[PDB]
Amino acid sequence: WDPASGLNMTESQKGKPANITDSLSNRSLIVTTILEEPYVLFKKSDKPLY
Amino acid sequence: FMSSRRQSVLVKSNEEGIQRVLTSDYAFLMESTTIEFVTQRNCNLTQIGG
Ligand SMILES: *[C@@H]1O[C@H](CO)[C@@H](O[C@@H]2O[C@H](CO)[C@@H](O[C@@H]3O[C@H](CO[C@H]4O[C@H](CO)[C@@H](O)[C@H](O)[C@@H]4O)[C@@H](O)[C@H](O[C@H]4O[C@H](CO)[C@@H](O)[C@H](O)[C@@H]4O)[C@@H]3O)[C@H](O)[C@H]2NC(C)=O)[C@H](O)[C@H]1NC(C)=O
Ligand SMILES: *[C@@H]1O[C@H](CO)[C@@H](O)[C@H](O)[C@H]1NC(C)=O
Ligand SMILES: *[C@@H]1O[C@H](CO)[C@@H](O)[C@H](O)[C@H]1NC(C)=O
């Protein structure tokens, strides 16, 4: 620790180096989709939509 | 339909529901115990559905 710097941890704990793994996830599945009526026609909502 | 045009089709009374049927081309949805009072003192109006 250093009042100027802060915690400079030596976080490496190589007694057991391999620690954790994560999970592949949602990815949101980008759908290429054009507008055609009555399929993907726009809304007549009286506000901006997201 | 009503969420699109939610300033013009929606009156705020049972009275303005009567008048805009009598003047405009308008199919106001009233409670059935008031339709039985309106369509028996104003014989130019009616009750469409069940
Ligand atoms: C002794 O000498 C020192 C330096 O020569 C003088 O200054 C004091 O010491 C340090 C250096 O300036 C100051 O510490 C800092 O305090 C911040 C507090 O945030 C606010 O707190 C209140 C609101 O709650 C305000 O009144 C105040 O002005 C601050 O804006 C910390 O948030 C600072 O950031 C970092 O802190 C540590 C790293 O040190 C980590 O947690 C983070 O990295 C964080 O970002 C910083 O620590 C201190 O405030 C100075 N003043 C005082 C009064 O102590 C001293 O004046 C001098 N004399 C005495 C008596 O101490
Ligand atoms: C913390 O110590 C290491 C070891 O040399 C080095 O990265 C540096 O001195 C310190 N890190 C930072 C961000 O200051
Ligand atoms: C219904 O309205 C018309 C005008 O739109 C009017 O002439 C007629 O008298 C009304 N019917 C009754 C029973 O008053």
Curated annotation (Swiss-Prot), chain B:
L-glutamate binds at E31. Coiled coil: none annotated. It is found in: Cell membrane; Postsynaptic cell membrane. Glycans are attached at N44. Highest expression is found in the olfactory lobe, piriform cortex, dentate gyrus, hippocampus, granular cell layer of the cerebellum, and in caudate-putamen. Sumoylation mediates kainate receptor-mediated endocytosis and regulates synaptic transmission. Sumoylation is enhanced by PIAS3 and desumoylated by SENP1. Ubiquitinated. Ubiquitination regulates the GRIK2 levels at the synapse by leading kainate receptor degradation through proteasome. Belongs to the glutamate-gated ion channel (TC 1.A.10.1) family. GRIK2 subfamily. The postsynaptic actions of Glu are mediated by a variety of receptors that are named according to their selective agonists. This receptor binds domoate > kainate > quisqualate > glutamate. It does not bind AMPA without coexpression with GRIK5. Ionotropic glutamate receptor that functions as a cation-permeable ligand-gated ion channel, gated by L-glutamate and the glutamatergic agonist kainic acid. L-glutamate acts as an excitatory neurotransmitter at many synapses in the central nervous system. Binding of the excitatory neurotransmitter L-glutamate induces a conformation change, leading to the opening of the cation channel, and thereby converts the chemical signal to an electrical impulse. The receptor then desensitizes rapidly and enters a transient inactive state, characterized by the presence of bound agonist. Independent of its ionotropic glutamate receptor activity, acts as a thermoreceptor conferring sensitivity to cold temperatures. Functions in dorsal root ganglion neurons. Homotetramer and heterotetramer with GRIK5. Tetramers may be formed by the dimerization of dimers. Assembles into a kainate-gated homomeric channel that does not bind AMPA. Can form functional heteromeric receptors with GRIK4 and GRIK5. Can form functional heteromeric receptors with GRIK3. Interacts with DLG4. Interacts with NETO2. Interacts (via C-terminus) with KLHL17 (via kelch repeats); the interaction targets GRIK2 for degradation via ubiquitin-proteasome pathway. This is Glutamate receptor ionotropic, kainate 2. The chain holds residues 708 to 757 of 908 of the full protein.
